[PDB]
Design a binder for this molecule. Structure first.
Ligand SMILES: [Ca+2]
Length: 348
């Protein structure tokens, strides 16, 4: 073999499904064999989100425990995804502007969840997606010096919930590496600047943040690798020890937002065997992994994770009504040129 994970001294991860469909890691022996062969860390794609930690008002860890156990038995550490996150679909019922005891319930959440997984999960996305993004502002709340005005922001009156989540997480499990995770922060534009402002504030307040996660939900040709590199550079520069992790890497062939509709693959058959996009995708995975290695010093590399095993498993398999092929394995679960691109980056 080898396997990708053997080619690095930092985690090489994959997000796994566990909600009973085709991609479900518990049922798919073919996927389990790929995870065991290739990776040495997993992230729960979905079942470690906030509400999955509850059955009513009480905590329920049955299904997440099952997954964390599976990891330990199959050569995988766990990156735990995620303690605090804003989407309505995964908020526990306590996380409401109508709860007078929000701050108490927030504490109980972080204290209970972090303690529960101590020794079983290497790292956490402690806070996910705290930065404003116009692409993800469905209620039209608008920005607040670059913060998303989520229920956590609204209840706290400010970004202090971020500070508290990291402190509580540190105290409940001192062994975990604690990450702040977000997307579009690799573009090197406004959200990158907002990230700088966020992280610097945490460092100023003495908050126990151990690293920054870049989701890296990228296109083949957007953003430029120069901008990806400079964004990571900007964050590396903020501290002598802050770790950088690539948390959710996937790479689209179709760019809706590029101004060119005639360079869109509109048919599933287009890239089922070969097309120019799969070959660029090899190069794109390679150039990203290379950027990460070059700019993140040895000893501050929190890991590289790809957001799923095989293409039909991807959240972007079909997106905005267009097909895509974002991952390292195809539908038949064969390695793609993308896989080789990761091989060549890691190996040198
Ligand atoms: Ca296009």
């Amino acid at each position: 073999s080898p396997g990708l994970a053997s080619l690095a001294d930092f985690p090489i991860g994959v997000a796994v499904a566990a909600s009973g469909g085709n991609a479900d890691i518990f049922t798919s022996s073919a996927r389990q064999n790929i995870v065991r062969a290739e990776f040495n860390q997993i992230t729960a794609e979905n079942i470690m989100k906030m509400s999955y930690m509850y059955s009513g008002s009480n905590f329920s860890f049955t299904n997440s425990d099952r997954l964390v156990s599976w990891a330990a038995q199959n050569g995988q550490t766990v990156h735990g995804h995620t303690l605090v996150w804003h989407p309505s679909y995964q908020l526990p019922n306590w996380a409401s502007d109508s709860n007078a005891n929000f701050r108490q319930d927030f504490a109980r959440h972080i204290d209970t969840v972090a303690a529960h997984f101590a020794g079983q999960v290497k790292s956490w996305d402690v806070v996910n997606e705290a930065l404003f993004d116009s692409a993800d502002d469905p209620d039209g709340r608008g920005s607040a010096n670059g913060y998303r005005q989520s229920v956590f922001y609204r209840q706290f009156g400010g970004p202090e919930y971020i500070d508290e989540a990291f402190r509580r997480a540190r105290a409940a499990d001192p062994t975990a590496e604690l990450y702040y995770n977000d997307f579009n922060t690799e573009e090197n534009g406004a959200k990158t600047t907002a990230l700088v402002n966020l992280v610097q504030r945490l460092l100023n307040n003495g908050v126990p943040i151990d690293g920054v996660g870049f989701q890296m939900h990228v296109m083949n040709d957007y953003p430029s690798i120069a901008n990806i590199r400079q964004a990571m550079q900007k964050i590396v520069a903020l501290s002598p020890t802050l770790k950088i992790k690539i948390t959710e890497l996937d790479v689209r062939l179709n760019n809706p937002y590029d101004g060119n509709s005639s360079n869109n693959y509109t048919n599933r058959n287009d890239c089922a065997v070969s097309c120019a996009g799969l070959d660029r995708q090899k190069a794109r995975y390679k150039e990203i992994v290379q950027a990460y290695l070059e700019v993140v010093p040895p000893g501050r590399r929190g890991g590289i994770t790809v957001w799923g095993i095989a293409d039909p498993d991807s959240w972007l398999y079909t997106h905005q009504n267009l097909p895509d092929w974002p991952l390292l394995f195809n539908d038949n679960l064969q390695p793609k040129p993308a896989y080789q691109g990761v091989v060549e980056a890691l190996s040198g």
